[PDB]
Protein backbone atom coordinates (compact mmCIF):
# COMPACT_ATOMS: atom_id res chain seq x y z
CA UNK A 1 0.00 0.00 0.00
CA UNK A 2 2.08 2.88 1.32
CA UNK A 3 -0.44 5.61 0.55
CA UNK A 4 -0.79 8.76 2.63
CA UNK A 5 -3.98 8.70 4.69
CA UNK A 6 -5.77 10.86 4.16
CA UNK A 7 -5.14 12.53 0.80
CA UNK A 8 -8.78 13.47 0.11
CA UNK A 9 -10.56 16.57 1.36
CA UNK A 10 -12.13 15.92 4.76
CA UNK A 11 -15.62 17.40 5.08
CA UNK A 12 -16.57 18.31 8.66
CA UNK A 13 -18.54 15.97 10.87
CA UNK A 14 -22.34 16.41 10.80
CA UNK A 15 -23.74 17.28 14.26
CA UNK A 16 -26.34 14.53 14.63
CA UNK A 17 -26.48 10.92 15.73
CA UNK A 18 -25.73 8.14 13.26
CA UNK A 19 -22.76 9.59 11.36
CA UNK A 20 -19.96 9.94 13.95
CA UNK A 21 -19.46 6.19 14.47
CA UNK A 22 -20.82 2.95 13.05
CA UNK A 23 -20.35 1.25 16.43
CA UNK A 24 -23.01 -0.74 18.28
CA UNK A 25 -24.87 1.57 20.64
CA UNK A 26 -27.29 1.30 23.53
CA UNK A 27 -30.75 2.58 24.43
CA UNK A 28 -31.61 4.68 27.48
CA UNK A 29 -32.36 1.51 29.50
CA UNK A 30 -29.48 -0.52 28.04
CA UNK A 31 -30.97 -2.34 25.03
CA UNK A 32 -28.40 -2.93 22.24
CA UNK A 33 -28.95 -0.61 19.27
CA UNK A 34 -27.61 -1.88 15.94
CA UNK A 35 -25.07 0.35 14.13
CA UNK A 36 -25.92 3.12 11.71
CA UNK A 37 -24.88 1.22 8.58
CA UNK A 38 -27.21 -1.66 9.50
CA UNK A 39 -30.19 -2.45 7.28
CA UNK A 40 -32.62 -2.46 10.23
CA UNK A 41 -32.67 1.36 10.42
CA UNK A 42 -34.57 1.88 7.16
CA UNK A 43 -37.77 1.83 9.24
CA UNK A 44 -38.80 2.62 12.81
CA UNK A 45 -39.53 0.12 15.58
CA UNK A 46 -42.16 0.84 18.23
CA UNK A 47 -42.40 -1.33 21.35
CA UNK A 48 -45.73 -2.12 22.98
Amino acid sequence: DGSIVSSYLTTRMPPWAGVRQNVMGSSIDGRPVLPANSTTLTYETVSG
Partner: protein, 150 residues
Amino acid sequence: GRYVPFHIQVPQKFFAIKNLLLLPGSYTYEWNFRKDVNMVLQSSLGNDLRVDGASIKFDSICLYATFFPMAHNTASTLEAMLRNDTNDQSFNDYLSAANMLYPIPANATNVPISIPSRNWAAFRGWAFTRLKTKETPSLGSGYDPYYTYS
Protein backbone atom coordinates in the same frame (compact mmCIF):
# COMPACT_ATOMS: atom_id res chain seq x y z
CA GLY B 1 -24.39 4.80 47.93
CA ARG B 2 -25.77 3.51 44.66
CA TYR B 3 -29.21 5.03 45.35
CA VAL B 4 -28.89 8.82 45.54
CA PRO B 5 -31.80 11.27 45.85
CA PHE B 6 -30.10 14.42 44.60
CA HIS B 7 -30.82 18.12 45.06
CA ILE B 8 -28.76 20.15 42.59
CA GLN B 9 -28.55 23.79 41.51
CA VAL B 10 -27.71 23.95 37.82
CA PRO B 11 -26.23 27.22 36.48
CA GLN B 12 -27.14 28.98 33.26
CA LYS B 13 -24.33 29.11 30.71
CA PHE B 14 -25.72 30.68 27.52
CA PHE B 15 -23.81 33.94 27.28
CA ALA B 16 -26.60 36.20 26.00
CA ILE B 17 -28.79 35.29 28.99
CA LYS B 18 -26.02 34.40 31.45
CA ASN B 19 -25.23 37.92 32.72
CA LEU B 20 -28.36 39.63 31.41
CA LEU B 21 -30.11 42.21 33.60
CA LEU B 22 -33.83 41.72 32.96
CA LEU B 23 -36.01 44.80 33.05
CA PRO B 24 -39.61 44.35 34.30
CA GLY B 25 -42.17 42.30 32.42
CA SER B 26 -43.50 38.77 32.21
CA TYR B 27 -41.05 36.46 30.45
CA THR B 28 -41.50 32.82 29.57
CA TYR B 29 -38.39 30.76 30.22
CA GLU B 30 -38.35 27.20 28.88
CA TRP B 31 -35.55 24.66 28.91
CA ASN B 32 -34.79 21.03 27.99
CA PHE B 33 -32.78 18.84 30.40
CA ARG B 34 -31.00 15.60 29.49
CA LYS B 35 -31.78 12.20 31.00
CA ASP B 36 -28.84 10.52 29.22
CA VAL B 37 -26.66 8.89 31.86
CA ASN B 38 -23.63 9.00 29.58
CA MET B 39 -24.08 12.78 29.33
CA VAL B 40 -25.41 13.85 32.73
CA LEU B 41 -22.94 11.60 34.58
CA GLN B 42 -19.20 10.96 34.57
CA SER B 43 -17.50 7.71 35.55
CA SER B 44 -13.82 7.21 36.35
CA LEU B 45 -13.46 4.30 33.92
CA GLY B 46 -15.53 5.59 31.01
CA ASN B 47 -17.90 2.62 30.88
CA ASP B 48 -21.31 2.62 29.21
CA LEU B 49 -23.68 3.59 32.03
CA ARG B 50 -26.74 2.79 29.92
CA VAL B 51 -25.78 -0.89 29.81
CA ASP B 52 -24.48 -0.69 33.39
CA GLY B 53 -27.88 0.13 34.87
CA ALA B 54 -27.47 3.80 35.70
CA SER B 55 -30.69 5.78 35.58
CA ILE B 56 -31.50 9.41 36.36
CA LYS B 57 -35.09 10.50 36.97
CA PHE B 58 -36.35 14.05 37.51
CA ASP B 59 -38.97 14.27 40.25
CA SER B 60 -39.53 18.04 40.37
CA ILE B 61 -37.81 21.20 39.17
CA CYS B 62 -37.85 24.88 40.11
CA LEU B 63 -36.49 28.22 38.91
CA TYR B 64 -34.98 30.53 41.50
CA ALA B 65 -34.20 34.21 41.04
CA THR B 66 -32.56 36.51 43.58
CA PHE B 67 -33.73 40.12 43.31
CA PHE B 68 -31.77 43.10 44.58
CA PRO B 69 -34.22 45.06 46.80
CA MET B 70 -33.66 48.31 44.92
CA ALA B 71 -35.65 51.43 45.75
CA HIS B 72 -38.70 51.93 43.56
CA ASN B 73 -37.58 55.39 42.43
CA THR B 74 -34.06 54.13 41.72
CA ALA B 75 -35.17 50.93 39.97
CA SER B 76 -37.62 52.97 37.89
CA THR B 77 -34.83 55.33 36.85
CA LEU B 78 -32.57 52.38 35.98
CA GLU B 79 -35.45 50.74 34.09
CA ALA B 80 -35.99 53.94 32.10
CA MET B 81 -32.29 54.36 31.28
CA LEU B 82 -31.80 50.76 30.13
CA ARG B 83 -34.68 50.87 27.63
CA ASN B 84 -32.93 53.47 25.48
CA ASP B 85 -31.40 51.86 22.41
CA THR B 86 -28.09 53.58 23.18
CA ASN B 87 -28.03 51.71 26.52
CA ASP B 88 -28.55 48.23 25.09
CA GLN B 89 -26.68 45.51 26.92
CA SER B 90 -24.09 43.75 24.79
CA PHE B 91 -22.38 40.45 25.55
CA ASN B 92 -19.79 38.23 23.90
CA ASP B 93 -19.23 34.50 24.14
CA TYR B 94 -15.94 33.86 25.92
CA LEU B 95 -14.83 31.17 23.48
CA SER B 96 -16.10 33.21 20.49
CA ALA B 97 -15.34 30.56 17.92
CA ALA B 98 -17.00 28.67 15.10
CA ASN B 99 -16.39 25.03 16.01
CA MET B 100 -15.76 22.49 13.26
CA LEU B 101 -15.10 18.81 13.97
CA TYR B 102 -13.24 16.87 11.28
CA PRO B 103 -13.10 13.05 11.34
CA ILE B 104 -9.60 11.56 11.29
CA PRO B 105 -9.49 7.85 10.35
CA ALA B 106 -7.58 5.24 12.29
CA ASN B 107 -3.79 5.37 11.75
CA ALA B 108 -4.21 8.49 9.60
CA THR B 109 -1.30 10.92 9.33
CA ASN B 110 -2.45 13.72 7.00
CA VAL B 111 -5.70 15.63 7.60
CA PRO B 112 -6.57 18.18 4.88
CA ILE B 113 -9.51 20.52 5.55
CA SER B 114 -10.87 23.51 3.66
CA ILE B 115 -13.08 26.58 4.03
CA PRO B 116 -14.51 27.26 0.53
CA SER B 117 -14.47 31.07 0.05
CA ARG B 118 -15.24 33.65 2.69
CA ASN B 119 -14.80 37.21 3.85
CA TRP B 120 -12.18 36.89 6.60
CA ALA B 121 -12.83 40.29 8.19
CA ALA B 122 -12.50 40.43 12.00
CA PHE B 123 -10.91 36.99 12.15
CA ARG B 124 -9.02 36.33 15.37
CA GLY B 125 -7.07 33.11 14.88
CA TRP B 126 -7.10 29.36 15.29
CA ALA B 127 -7.00 27.05 18.28
CA PHE B 128 -6.97 23.35 17.52
CA THR B 129 -6.88 20.10 19.49
CA ARG B 130 -7.26 16.47 18.46
CA LEU B 131 -10.20 14.72 20.13
CA LYS B 132 -11.28 11.08 20.22
CA THR B 133 -14.37 10.03 18.30
CA LYS B 134 -15.39 7.67 21.12
CA GLU B 135 -15.20 10.44 23.73
CA THR B 136 -17.17 13.04 21.75
CA PRO B 137 -20.98 12.94 21.68
CA SER B 138 -23.07 13.75 18.63
CA LEU B 139 -24.58 16.95 19.97
CA GLY B 140 -27.27 18.60 17.89
CA SER B 141 -29.43 15.50 17.91
CA GLY B 142 -31.76 15.03 20.85
CA TYR B 143 -30.26 11.68 21.81
CA ASP B 144 -27.06 9.92 20.77
CA PRO B 145 -27.68 6.14 20.95
CA TYR B 146 -24.16 5.39 19.71
CA TYR B 147 -22.32 7.29 22.47
CA THR B 148 -21.28 4.38 24.69
CA TYR B 149 -18.90 6.33 26.90
CA SER B 150 -19.30 8.09 30.25
